[PDB]
Amino acid sequence: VVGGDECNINEHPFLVALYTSASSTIHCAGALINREWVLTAAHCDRRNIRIKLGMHSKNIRNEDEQIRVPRGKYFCLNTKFPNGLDKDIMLIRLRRPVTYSTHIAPVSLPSRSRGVGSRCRIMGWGKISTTTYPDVPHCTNIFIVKHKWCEPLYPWVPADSRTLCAGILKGGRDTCHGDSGGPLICNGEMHGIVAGGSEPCGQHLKPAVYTKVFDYNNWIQSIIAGNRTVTCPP
Ligand SMILES: *[C@@H]1O[C@H](CO)[C@@H](O)[C@H](O)[C@H]1NC(C)=O
Numbered sequence: 354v355v356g357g358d359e360c361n362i363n364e365h366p367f368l369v370a371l372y373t374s375a376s377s378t379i380h381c382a383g384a385l386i387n388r389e390w391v392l393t394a395a396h397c398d399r400r401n402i403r404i405k406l407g408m409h410s411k412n413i414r415n416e417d418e419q420i421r422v423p424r425g426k427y428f429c430l431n432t433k434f435p436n437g438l439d440k441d442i443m444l445i446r447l448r449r450p451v452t453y454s455t456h457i458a459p460v461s462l463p464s465r466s467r468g469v470g471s472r473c474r475i476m477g478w479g480k481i482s483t484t485t486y487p488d489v490p491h492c493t494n495i496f497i498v499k500h501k502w503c504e505p506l507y508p509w510v511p512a513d514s515r516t517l518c519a520g521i522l523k524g525g526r527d528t529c530h531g532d533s534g535g536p537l538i539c540n541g542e543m544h545g546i547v548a549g550g551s552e553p554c555g556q557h558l559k560p561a562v563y564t565k566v567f568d569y570n571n572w573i574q575s576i577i578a579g580n581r582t583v584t585c586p587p
Contacts, residue, residue, distance in 0.1 A: 354477050354493055354529060355481055355526065356526030356555060359490070359492075360409070364492070367543075368382060368384065368477075369382065369393075370382055371397055371534060372403045373400070374403055380397065380531065380533075382476075382478065382531075383397070383404065384536040385406060385460065386444075386459055386573070388450040388452070389450040390577055391447065392444060392546060393535075394442060395428050395429070395438070395442055396548075397443070397534035404423075404447070405419075406419045406420075407419050407457040411489075415455075421449060422448050426444070427443065427444040427446075431587070434509065438548075439509065440515065440585055444573060444576050444577070460542070461542050462542065462570050463539075463567040463570065466567045467497065467540065469499055471539045473494065473497060473538055474492060474538045475492070475526075475528050475538075476491065477491070477531060477535040478532075479491075479531030479533075480529040494526070495520045495527070497539070498560050502560050514562075515565045515568040516564055517564075517565050518561075519563055520550070520559070520560030522560065524557035527555040527556075527561055528550060530554070532547050533547045534546060544565070545564060546564040547561070549561065549562055572585045
């Protein structure tokens with residue numbers, strides 16, 4: 354995240370970090386939905402995913418920090434692109450649940466749709482400057498802007514994409530490499546999943562793309578309930 358500062362240690366209990374059994378590098382983030390489910394971006398998937406919960410600094414572990422592996426991973430199977438990037442979302446079921454604590458808590462799904470003008474907060478362990486990754490997650494506030502700003506830049510995100518375009522038109526604040534899969538928080542609810550932006554991040558007139566969670570609420574709840582034939586919103 355560029356244009357922000359280290360997050361308050363207690364403000365991101367739902368934030369999880371994703372890495373692999375082969376690399377300790379945080380390639381993406383995710384959000385805890387309940388005691389055994391994490392919501393993230395589909396492109397964040399990897400063969401041997403490892404999830405860190407309750408973490409702030411990568412070098413000073415919180416008392417309640419936990420590590421988990423998936424017992425199940427679920428995707429949208431009715432996508433426009435074969436690589437599935439038009440519906441960049443995935444559910445990960447933890448092999449073993451976690452218990453809530455100061456640094457581990459669930460984030461609520463959106464109770465209603467929110468759009469242009471909404472002030473939201475982004476967070477992650479992604480780049481904070483040219484080739485610079487922090488040891489602690491960074492946070493900053495951005496705005497959901499007219500979806501038209503994104504459509505041209507990412508011609509694979511059409512006008513009807515179930516996505517939110519967000520950032521600061523003047524530039525300076527944006528999600529970056531390593532932040533994908535993280536939550537976009539608006540009014541205390543997770544309204545988006547970081548999907549991707551332009552490189553370098555934070556450029557003038559180049560907001561980023563966030564998967565619009567609200568549209569996937571029913572799919573998410575059905576999957577968590579155990580349904581395995583439910584499809585993602587068309
Ligand atoms: C799964 O969800 C679909 C869509 O809501 C529904 O039609 C179907 O009956 C459900 N199946 C189960 C396991 O109840």
